[PDB]
Design a protein around this nucleic acid. Structure first.
Ligand SMILES: [K+]
Ligand SMILES: [K+]
Ligand SMILES: [K+]
Ligand SMILES: [K+]
Ligand SMILES: [K+]
Ligand SMILES: [K+]
Ligand SMILES: [K+]
Ligand SMILES: [Mg+2]
Ligand SMILES: [Mg+2]
Ligand SMILES: [Mg+2]
Ligand SMILES: [Mg+2]
Ligand SMILES: [Mg+2]
Ligand SMILES: [Mg+2]
Ligand SMILES: [Mg+2]
Ligand SMILES: [Mg+2]
Ligand SMILES: [Mg+2]
Ligand SMILES: [Mg+2]
Ligand SMILES: [Mg+2]
Ligand SMILES: [Mg+2]
Ligand SMILES: [Mg+2]
Ligand SMILES: [Mg+2]
Ligand SMILES: [Mg+2]
Ligand SMILES: [Mg+2]
Ligand SMILES: [Mg+2]
Ligand SMILES: [Mg+2]
Ligand SMILES: [Mg+2]
Ligand SMILES: [Mg+2]
Ligand SMILES: [Mg+2]
Ligand SMILES: [Mg+2]
Ligand SMILES: [Mg+2]
Ligand SMILES: [Mg+2]
Ligand SMILES: [Mg+2]
Ligand SMILES: [Mg+2]
Ligand SMILES: [Mg+2]
Ligand SMILES: [Mg+2]
Ligand SMILES: [Mg+2]
Ligand SMILES: [Mg+2]
Ligand SMILES: [Mg+2]
Ligand SMILES: [Mg+2]
Ligand SMILES: [Mg+2]
Ligand SMILES: [Mg+2]
Ligand code: NA
Ligand code: NA
Ligand code: NA
Ligand code: NA
Ligand code: NA
Ligand code: NA
Ligand code: NA
Ligand code: NA
Ligand code: NA
Lengths: 67, 157, 97
RNA sequence: AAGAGAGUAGCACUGUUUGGGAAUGCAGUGUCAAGCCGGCAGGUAUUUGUCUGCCAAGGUUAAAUAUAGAG
RNA sequence: UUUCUCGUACUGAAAGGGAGGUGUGAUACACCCGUGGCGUGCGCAAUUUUUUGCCCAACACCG
RNA sequence: AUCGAACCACCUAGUAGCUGGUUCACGUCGAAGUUUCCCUCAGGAUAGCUGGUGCUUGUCAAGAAGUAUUGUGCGGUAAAGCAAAUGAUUAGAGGGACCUAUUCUCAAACUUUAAAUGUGCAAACAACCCAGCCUUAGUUAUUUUAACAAGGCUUUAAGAAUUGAGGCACCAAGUGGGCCUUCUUCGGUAAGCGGAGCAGGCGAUGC
RNA sequence: AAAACAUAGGUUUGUGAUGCAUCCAAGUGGUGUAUGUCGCAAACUGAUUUCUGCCCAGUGCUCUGUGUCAACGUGACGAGAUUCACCGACGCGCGGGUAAACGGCGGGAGUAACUAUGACUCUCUUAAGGUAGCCAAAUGCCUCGUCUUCCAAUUAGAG
RNA sequence: AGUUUGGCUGGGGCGGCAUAUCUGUUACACGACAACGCAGGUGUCCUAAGGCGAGCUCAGUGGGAACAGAAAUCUCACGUGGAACACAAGCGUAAAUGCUUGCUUGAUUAACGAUUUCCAGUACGAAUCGAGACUGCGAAAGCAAGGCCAGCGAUCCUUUGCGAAGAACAGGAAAUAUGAACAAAUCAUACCAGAGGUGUCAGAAUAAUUACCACAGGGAUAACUGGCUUGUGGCGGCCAAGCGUUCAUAGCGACGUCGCUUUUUGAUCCUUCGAUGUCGGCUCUUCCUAACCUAGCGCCGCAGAAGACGCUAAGGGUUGGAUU
RNA sequence: GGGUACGACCAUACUUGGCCGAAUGCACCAUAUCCCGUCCGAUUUGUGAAGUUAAGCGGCCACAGGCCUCGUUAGUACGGCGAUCAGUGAUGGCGCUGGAACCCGGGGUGUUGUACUCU
RNA sequence: GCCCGGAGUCCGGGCACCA
């Protein structure tokens, strides 16, 4: 008793029932884990300095307000 | 027996054009790439190293990583009822800079020049006029077309 | 295939940390130990009246085996194992054409 | 001043049983102890030295427990 | 403050070990009304016919 | 009245991917016969199609669209050619083979050329410019580049779209024998035959 | 209901009793055996008549002097578990016998005064190459074989 | 005594492998697509046939030289690759990816970096882009961690390598851990990386027969009728090279070509497996016409007789026996 | 109007033949002590100026081939969507629309960047 | 795989099999 082997019938209609979802936006899931290491290490050092400057700025803004 | 190897249908896809064989030229070597650029992925077929899979031939995407002899590109691909962002690694010979945004950038520059001219008082170029309106048509002579019965004898081989 | 009897290779040991001369020997499995844990359990399970308690695998299909080489450093006598592709005939000559 | 249960305990082979795993308990046969530096146990096998707890191979004994086709 | 159990701490095969912030220096030192930083963020507060602040929950990225 | 393993009671309500059955009403929604793996092919697991519960929000539209336009990439089918390479092939002519230029007729596993229908990307705010500024163990002979930031400036005619709620979860059912048709298409003399592609139907539905 | 079984006739095998065949969970247990080779147990063929050919390479059964095969023993290294060495039977291999044990028992060329046929020759090959007999037979595919007889005519019957 | 005795499949069996896999085409110019569709491959081979530098140009053709000729070696010119690149095919390549030669071991290690192909966006195989060690070839830029894309394998179990020696008043940046009452030496185990294999290739340990046969089911599936088709079987047309003393067509008609029928046999598997009684003969009725006899006609190579061909016409008739 | 060195695009630049070429330069050219390499200083390597535009090179020409471009082939071949369209069929035209290829004809035969330089 | 015997080693034997 043989039977069908393969078909793609009705598959396109099923996929469009809930539609082809759009791709994720460019600003999400944008890590660079597997990238070129020498540039990644340099960026980490700059990011650490930037965080230190951000903390100091809020300290100065608050102290100015308390006057 | 079709077989599903890495290049299972690429007889005409991965072939060079007529009288255009050879290896990449110098201008291709000095291209330079930056993260965030738009590139087209096209196989060269003369450089076997770092060739992308046949699906990604003729696809456009954004580069996310640069290595000494390679470029990483993000490309959309639809699977079932969704689309996946795939990351592929290719050699620099198989990528070209994309001109898919040059019309948009030119429009922005024109608008900026419009503002500068208005604020500097510079006269503006005159507006183009559509030809879909009416008008007078005065012809020197009028011809006729009436199926002159020589065409009927003409379409006989 | 033919393999040289000696070759120059990198020794990762802190004593060498350079390219040294290595001697080549072919790997052969050791003799199965009585009183190994798996053998002790198998012997306990086999005693009695049950019969044969585990499969025996008669359906062999391959005709070759992978080649493993034991490379011994000239100094520090450390051993590194390497794997070659399967061949029907293997020999060491250390003599070219 | 003495003593405290011998084909007994242990060991080997075989079989069975157990969660018990280089062998938890038991049975058959062979072999078969110690006690002027004793014996058994202490969950990985062997030899040696300490430490801890107990002292088999004879016997009786209420209550708290069961009544899953009884009286 | 139960006598047992689940949870407030996890990690390694195991021996074992075990998580706050800011500032200053290269079991370090001094403080404790306190979101590690950045991005998007209900509502409330403040300006003027719009802009800004705090941002809760949640998500992404880097320590 | 029982024999290619008697009869009686018990283990025994033995197991069955297989056949049969499975008891009130109305309402809101509503399918699949396809993918991968399995001693798998009358069965399962897995993704897809569906229902329920929502969460975070918005209210004209964010990460919207089985549709256009503009710009910019991809292609070797239909057609065409053999007076162009590869393969097949007919006949005269000019200097029996041979040479030169032609000539009849061809190709799913030939091709210089090459459509229609297709297919990727872009068409703004988590953004782009302009200016000055900080940091780095990145690059460079140094500047200059690369990357992360911080305080100010600007920005929502030419056929020149138009439609509108965005995003994110948890739990679970049935199904996993399909069949028909316009057009494209392989095997077969053919078949109400066997097997595929895009789309629409029946199955589940009457009028 | 037979062409099957049995039968008388024929042949073969084991066996002298502490035996051969054999029941049985077991014993100073049981059967042929209250028996003793003109006996008992186990096979095959199937009255009488006339006969019973060749093959021991295969498988089986059976009879005689050193490779391999287990425990138990005897020695060693080691502190000991562990390990090593030597010894080690029937059987299997070697060497004989056996077909009224299971069974088996050939191809291809040439050649005689008309053609035909082939007494004769050559060749390859086996453990042996189907002998005496019998046949389109309940055994012959081709096949309703070919000839004679029986009939007017016979895929039937007989020779 | 117990158990087993693959699967797919135009029924099943025998055959084959479409059972794990590579190339071209079917495939309809993105990607994807079936059949026991077409044409072919794979379980290997290589210390060089791997790596790099340098030099060179291949297949073939034409003109020349004792033996020497169509074909031996030398020389000049042309030569877009028509050669070669282990093997199947496709792609690719000319101061090279080809050939010769020189030197070598990037076929090593590579902190669990990221990714592609199949795809559930799992594993396995193969491949791509990186970072660190030590190197090879180069004057250098640079190239190379195999031979480009096919050539291979889970849990459990066995087995090998690494955890050298010393240094630290204490387990630390840097000393592998355990054998649970504790010490000395053996033995065993654990953590990391390989190897011994499952070809039914996501991986059970496996011989037959049943006509003495059994059960659960299946029209998801064969053996009758019926249905679609008509290759094969049967019955006919059209054209006209020839046969007919001459004369294509009285009667025939080759080489070709167009049909009809369902009285043969195939092809298929739609209905029936909680059953539609399966060859032949006997008996009886009816229908069809492609007309054997009976009625009436045309035509002939129809003198008569007997016949050949054709038309209307199915009212009526169509036997007795031997063998099976 | 030019030369040389290094290039970009890679035939409008290639192939064949003919003619001409002021200067700077580029070449052909002389020779093997040393560096170096070959069967052979042919190529390659090291050192000079004796000759010459012969060749290479540049420029121009050819009813020259090829190549590039524009027309023509032609709204032809082919195509998407539609019909209770035509036709026994094989196939075909129609409506709304997209649109080729060779042959053939006209034209053309490199553009250009950096530095040192000659008239 | 073990024991051999006959040729650094290929054959013939008698045994033994948890990926
Ligand atoms: K005892
Ligand atoms: K399923
Ligand atoms: K009878
Ligand atoms: K009778
Ligand atoms: K009778
Ligand atoms: K008898
Ligand atoms: K007789
Ligand atoms: Mg192409
Ligand atoms: Mg006592
Ligand atoms: Mg008592
Ligand atoms: Mg029940
Ligand atoms: Mg039912
Ligand atoms: Mg509804
Ligand atoms: Mg399996
Ligand atoms: Mg194609
Ligand atoms: Mg065509
Ligand atoms: Mg399911
Ligand atoms: Mg249904
Ligand atoms: Mg309807
Ligand atoms: Mg009767
Ligand atoms: Mg007789
Ligand atoms: Mg007789
Ligand atoms: Mg015999
Ligand atoms: Mg027989
Ligand atoms: Mg004889
Ligand atoms: Mg006969
Ligand atoms: Mg007969
Ligand atoms: Mg008769
Ligand atoms: Mg007779
Ligand atoms: Mg397509
Ligand atoms: Mg395609
Ligand atoms: Mg080279
Ligand atoms: Mg490979
Ligand atoms: Mg490296
Ligand atoms: Mg490679
Ligand atoms: Mg019978
Ligand atoms: Mg059916
Ligand atoms: Mg019925
Ligand atoms: Mg009935
Ligand atoms: Mg009936
Ligand atoms: Mg319609
Ligand atoms: Na199916
Ligand atoms: Na069913
Ligand atoms: Na008889
Ligand atoms: Na014999
Ligand atoms: Na005879
Ligand atoms: Na007869
Ligand atoms: Na089957
Ligand atoms: Na027919
Ligand atoms: Na008639």
């Amino acid at each position: 008793a043989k039977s069908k082997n393969h078909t793609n019938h009705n598959q396109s209609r099923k996929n469009h029932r809930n539609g082809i979802k759009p791709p994720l936006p460019l600003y999400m899931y944008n890590s660079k884990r597997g990238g070129w290491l020498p540039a990644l290490v340099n960026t980490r050092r700059v990011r650490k300095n930037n965080q230190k400057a951000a903390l100091k700025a809020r300290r100065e803004r608050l102290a100015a307000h308390q006057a | 027996v079709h077989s599903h190897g890495y290049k299972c249908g690429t007889r005409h896809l991965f072939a060079k054009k007529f009288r255009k064989h050879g290896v990449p030229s110098v201008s291709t070597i000095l291209t330079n790439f930056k993260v965030g650029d738009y590139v087209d992925v096209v196989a060269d077929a003369a450089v076997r190293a770092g060739m992308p899979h046949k699906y990604y031939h003729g696809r456009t995407g954004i580069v996310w990583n640069v290595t000494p002899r390679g470029v990483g590109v993000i490309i959309n691909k639809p699977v079932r009822n969704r689309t996946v962002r795939k990351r592929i690694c290719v050699r620099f010979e198989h990528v070209r800079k994309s001109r898919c945004q040059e019309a948009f950038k030119q429009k922005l520059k024109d608008l900026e020049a419009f503002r500068a001219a208005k604020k500097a008082g510079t006269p503006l170029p005159p507006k183009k006029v559509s030809t879909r309106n009416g008008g007078f048509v005065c012809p020197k002579k009028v011809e006729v077309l009436a199926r002159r019965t020589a065409d009927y004898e003409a379409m006989i081989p | 295939v033919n393999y040289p009897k000696k070759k120059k290779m990198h020794c990762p040991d802190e004593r060498c940390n350079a390219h040294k001369s290595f001697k080549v020997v072919q790997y052969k499995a050791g003799k199965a130990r009585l009183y190994a844990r798996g053998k002790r359990r198998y012997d306990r399970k086999q005693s009695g009246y049950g019969g044969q308690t585990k499969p025996i695998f008669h359906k062999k299909a391959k005709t070759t085996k992978k080649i493993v080489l034991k490379l011994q450093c000239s100094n520090c006598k450390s051993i590194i194992q390497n794997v070659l592709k399967r061949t029907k005939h293997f020999e060491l000559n250390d003599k070219k054409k």
